[PDB]
Amino acid sequence: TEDHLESLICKVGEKSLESNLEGLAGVLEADLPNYKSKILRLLCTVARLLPEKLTIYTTLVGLLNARNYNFGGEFVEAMIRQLKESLKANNYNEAVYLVRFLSDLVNCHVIAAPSMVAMFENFVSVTQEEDVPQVRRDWYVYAFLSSLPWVGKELYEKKDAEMDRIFANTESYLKRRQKTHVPMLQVWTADKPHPQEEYLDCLWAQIQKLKKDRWQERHILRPYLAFDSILCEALQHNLPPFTPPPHTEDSVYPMPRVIFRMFDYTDDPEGPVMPGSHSVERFVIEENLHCIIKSHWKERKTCAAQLVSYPGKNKIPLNYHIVEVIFAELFQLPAPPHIDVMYTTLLIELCKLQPGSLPQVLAQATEMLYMRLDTMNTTCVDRFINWFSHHLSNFQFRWSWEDWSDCLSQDPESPKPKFVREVLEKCMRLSYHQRILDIVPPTFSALCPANPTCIYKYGDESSNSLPGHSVALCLAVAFKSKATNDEIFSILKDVPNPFNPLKIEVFVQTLLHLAAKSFSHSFSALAKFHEVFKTLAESDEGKLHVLRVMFEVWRNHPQMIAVLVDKMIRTQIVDCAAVANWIFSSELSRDFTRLFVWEILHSTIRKMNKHVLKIQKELEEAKEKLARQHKRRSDDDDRSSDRKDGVLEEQIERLQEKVESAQSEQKNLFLVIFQRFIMILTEHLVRCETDGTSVLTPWYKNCIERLQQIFLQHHQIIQQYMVTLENLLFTAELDPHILAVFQQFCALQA
Amino acid sequence: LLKALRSDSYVELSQYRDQHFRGDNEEQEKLLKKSCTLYVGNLSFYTTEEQIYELFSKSGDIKKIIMGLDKMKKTACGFCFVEYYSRADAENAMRYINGTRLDDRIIRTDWDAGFKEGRQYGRGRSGGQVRDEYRQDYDAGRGGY
Ligand SMILES: C[n+]1cn([C@@H]2O[C@H](COP(=O)(O)OP(=O)(O)O)[C@@H](O)[C@H]2O)c2nc(N)[nH]c(=O)c21
């Protein structure tokens, strides 16, 4: 039954629970003497791996501790070692799960209450440390506060005098916390419907309400209440004087967050009265549901079934909470906890799992998001754009568009009309141009996407006066005759020279127009004539000129240029630096606010980041080969491996210098983007000041938030460039509006 | 780790095997596990290379898409092969995009041993997919019977 023990441990939570707990203690006792070490490992792992039902497992420990006092002895000691090493590994996400598990144990009388108070004193005392990042101080305070709901009433009455000083110290710290990072993190800057506040501020207020009403909560479930008689005689265990690990340079702390509300109890009048925003029982609901998503993110069917059957579903309206939680996971703008596409399909299975009510609230939830689009962070809008279009894709594109009739009588660059324009454009990607026109009411015909057809400058009937037209027709027959690369050069030799920009334009326009049928034809054309592009576009400005003429060919088909540039980079036709310059070129200025251009920039960045990691990975494995051979050389004294080591020694140095070459290339890419980002924004700021116009414009609002978004999606990489950015680009002389973005980013993690 | 949490009944290979493959069963077993190409099923005949690229780009970047053409008609038979750069990226598409409606049509995905020349043509007697001949019901997406 070695494999049986872990199975039955996981079975207790699923689906007479108290009777199930009682039986579980008996079977655990039978094989405890010979499997004690293995049992401790299983309980320790499930304490951090399964925080969704930690109250269930705490009662299991209490019953085992009650029957065997010695069992609870080493288990607590083993639990501390797990916590002690977890902090050393900078794995704080489950560290809070562990400290919650310890806190709930005092309810099961496993842990002495005074010892737990001294444990929290050290956590709060971290704020008294100096020269330590403010983020680290936040986590320890968060860990203590987060565990309070499970330990609120019982711990308070025992040692109120001590923890009141603890509460004062925590309250004192929250007053002087830096709040510079909130504006980046809040999805909505507006406060009228529901304010967005930092998690500590929201959590603290909920604790105050819980403290106000004598620490009573209704949502949480406490199985140990039923086993009151048994746990009374159990002897408590005193915790060792734990101390937090000292701060180290390599230590990494979790980023600050912000919890957003999109629902109010007035939204569902007939249903159960859901907890208010500053209600502690609401926090535990979202926290459990987040862990449900975290635990079963791989299995969408299993995840959907688990959260819908959430314990205590009768008290609280599940449909409104689950929808809010999914959007909460989706709009964590630093990074969603999983792949973005997971949430789109998760709601699909949820929708079909509860067809009775969930489609109604989800439709209502979508409308609520639409009305708040006036002040929503753009990086979250793109996630909203992708989900809503995809959700419409697998629902026959059925929607009451006439409801959003207000978008027509607005500025075309206002967020609401822009949202409609982007959604239809994305819906165009999944269907036909005619298909979108049919479903949309005719009044929105102005917002319908344009027909994605190639634009040929050298058209048959356009004009014969355009330069190079005679040469252009020669390219057409050459391509249709499957000409070789060398003879293509001969045709280009006749092009007059005003490097030659004219040669690029005539070659690109003809080649793209010929391969305008599909992506496969276009990909083949570039591969077929790979050498031609490399020879012609040798200069950096020549590489840039390839993109601008390419954009003119497919201005009306954003998806076509979405992948066309991607293939060019991987074929070394144009480096990432050229693409970044092309984005901010005056040619794209009119469409700079479009969503598709930013997908280009991020895809280019990801390719550079992915490529440099692969080179680093290749260096590491080659480095380990030296370690592997040296270990074998020590074991087997072979003198013929000296030449073998020499082969890899000259190999690794080539990789090492290549990494520096690659890292410098990656560093240059971000430097170019930020350098190019400053000049455009500064130009906007000075002209608005000179002309007296308001700075807050739809163009400026969209552009400034893109600067935040690129910071957020690659903060880990940008961490290596703090010295360079501060000394060169982001300086004190810079405008405060631009510098404020860097002000919050550096304080975001440090 | 934990036995229950590590379970994911979407990445594991299906019972399908390519009988045209040169090698025994175990060769696919090891090759399928370390593979970055997956096969889709029962696409609409009117679907296009752009649509499938857009849908699967959500999981991650694509290296190459091979449309499933007819043996003789040289026309799409409602299936295609999609190849990702990294295995981890391809798993997400299999975990989530699989079973999701596309062009008002439910699609089905499965791992593949890797693209080979001449493998994109339908192996059915008529020229399309073998399942087409055994199909009996009426559907416009698959050109009728
Ligand atoms: C059902 N199915 C068909 N194909 C591919 O589709 C083409 C023709 O498949 P088929 O001969 O119609 O499949 P069958 O023998 O199971 O009836 C070939 O290129 C096959 O590799 C398939 N390819 C993969 N990877 N997985 C599948 O389940 C699958």
Short mmCIF file of C-alpha atoms in Angstrom, two decimals, chain A residues 3 6 10 42 45-46 48-50 295-302 338-339 341-342 344-345 348-349 386-387 389-390 393-396 426 428-432 435 517-521 523 557 559 563 566-567 570 599 606-607 610, chain B residues 1-12 44-67 85-86 89 91-107:
data_model
loop_
_atom_site.label_atom_id
_atom_site.label_comp_id
_atom_site.label_asym_id
_atom_site.label_seq_id
_atom_site.Cartn_x
_atom_site.Cartn_y
_atom_site.Cartn_z
CA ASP A 3 1.17 3.91 -3.48
CA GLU A 6 -0.94 9.25 -1.04
CA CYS A 10 -6.07 13.24 -1.71
CA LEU A 42 3.05 13.43 2.15
CA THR A 45 3.76 18.40 0.48
CA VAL A 46 -0.04 18.59 0.53
CA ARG A 48 1.76 23.70 0.34
CA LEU A 49 0.50 21.99 -2.82
CA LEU A 50 -3.18 22.05 -1.79
CA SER A 295 -3.90 23.72 -9.03
CA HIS A 296 -5.76 22.48 -12.12
CA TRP A 297 -4.68 24.91 -14.83
CA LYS A 298 -3.54 22.07 -17.10
CA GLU A 299 -6.89 20.23 -17.04
CA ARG A 300 -9.59 22.64 -18.19
CA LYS A 301 -12.45 20.14 -17.80
CA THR A 302 -11.31 19.18 -14.30
CA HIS A 338 -0.85 31.04 -17.04
CA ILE A 339 -1.18 31.31 -20.81
CA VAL A 341 -5.70 31.51 -24.05
CA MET A 342 -6.54 29.28 -21.08
CA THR A 344 -10.96 32.06 -22.97
CA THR A 345 -11.61 28.32 -23.28
CA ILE A 348 -16.45 28.08 -22.64
CA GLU A 349 -16.52 24.84 -20.66
CA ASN A 386 -8.34 38.82 -27.78
CA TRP A 387 -10.78 37.12 -25.40
CA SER A 389 -13.24 38.12 -30.24
CA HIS A 390 -12.31 34.52 -29.46
CA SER A 393 -15.68 33.12 -32.53
CA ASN A 394 -17.02 29.92 -30.94
CA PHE A 395 -20.53 31.34 -30.43
CA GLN A 396 -21.53 32.00 -34.06
CA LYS A 426 -9.92 40.32 -34.81
CA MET A 428 -12.24 39.23 -39.28
CA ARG A 429 -9.13 37.11 -38.68
CA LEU A 430 -11.34 34.12 -37.86
CA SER A 431 -13.87 34.57 -40.69
CA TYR A 432 -14.49 36.20 -44.07
CA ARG A 435 -19.10 37.33 -43.00
CA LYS A 517 -2.44 34.36 -52.91
CA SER A 518 -1.53 32.94 -49.49
CA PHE A 519 1.08 32.88 -46.75
CA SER A 520 2.66 29.70 -48.11
CA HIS A 521 3.32 31.32 -51.49
CA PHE A 523 6.96 32.30 -47.52
CA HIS A 557 -4.15 43.29 -44.50
CA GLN A 559 -2.39 39.87 -40.55
CA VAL A 563 3.76 37.15 -40.12
CA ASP A 566 8.40 37.52 -38.58
CA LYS A 567 9.78 35.35 -41.39
CA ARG A 570 14.32 34.53 -38.72
CA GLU A 599 1.93 42.58 -31.79
CA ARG A 606 10.29 37.55 -27.89
CA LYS A 607 12.37 36.16 -30.76
CA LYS A 610 14.16 33.30 -26.97
CA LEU B 1 5.24 16.72 -6.66
CA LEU B 2 1.87 15.03 -6.24
CA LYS B 3 0.35 12.18 -8.23
CA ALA B 4 -3.07 13.80 -8.68
CA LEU B 5 -1.90 17.32 -9.55
CA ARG B 6 0.63 16.14 -12.14
CA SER B 7 -2.16 14.40 -14.06
CA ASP B 8 -3.08 16.09 -17.35
CA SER B 9 -5.26 14.04 -19.69
CA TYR B 10 -4.56 16.24 -22.71
CA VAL B 11 -0.83 15.96 -23.48
CA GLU B 12 -0.72 12.16 -23.61
CA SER B 44 -14.27 23.09 -42.95
CA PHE B 45 -13.36 22.81 -46.62
CA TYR B 46 -13.81 26.58 -46.91
CA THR B 47 -11.29 27.31 -44.15
CA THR B 48 -8.07 29.05 -45.10
CA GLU B 49 -4.43 29.01 -44.04
CA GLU B 50 -4.86 32.45 -42.46
CA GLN B 51 -7.61 31.38 -40.05
CA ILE B 52 -5.78 28.36 -38.65
CA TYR B 53 -2.63 30.44 -38.26
CA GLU B 54 -4.52 33.09 -36.29
CA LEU B 55 -6.23 30.59 -33.99
CA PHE B 56 -3.12 28.60 -33.10
CA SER B 57 -0.92 31.69 -32.81
CA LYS B 58 -2.63 32.31 -29.47
CA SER B 59 -0.75 29.40 -27.90
CA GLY B 60 2.52 30.62 -29.38
CA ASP B 61 4.60 31.17 -32.47
CA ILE B 62 4.37 28.85 -35.48
CA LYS B 63 7.23 27.60 -37.63
CA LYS B 64 5.29 26.13 -40.55
CA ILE B 65 1.73 25.09 -41.42
CA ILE B 66 1.12 22.33 -43.96
CA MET B 67 -2.35 22.36 -45.50
CA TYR B 85 9.37 25.76 -32.36
CA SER B 86 9.23 24.39 -28.80
CA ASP B 89 4.50 25.79 -26.58
CA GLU B 91 1.42 21.44 -25.41
CA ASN B 92 -0.59 24.56 -24.57
CA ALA B 93 -2.31 24.43 -27.96
CA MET B 94 -3.17 20.78 -27.36
CA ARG B 95 -4.39 21.48 -23.83
CA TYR B 96 -6.68 24.42 -24.59
CA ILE B 97 -7.25 25.07 -28.29
CA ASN B 98 -8.21 21.43 -28.87
CA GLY B 99 -11.96 20.93 -28.81
CA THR B 100 -12.65 24.63 -29.38
CA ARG B 101 -15.06 25.64 -32.12
CA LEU B 102 -13.48 27.20 -35.22
CA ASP B 103 -15.51 28.63 -38.11
CA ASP B 104 -18.61 27.27 -36.37
CA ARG B 105 -16.97 23.83 -36.40
CA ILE B 106 -15.54 21.81 -33.52
CA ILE B 107 -11.93 20.79 -34.20
#
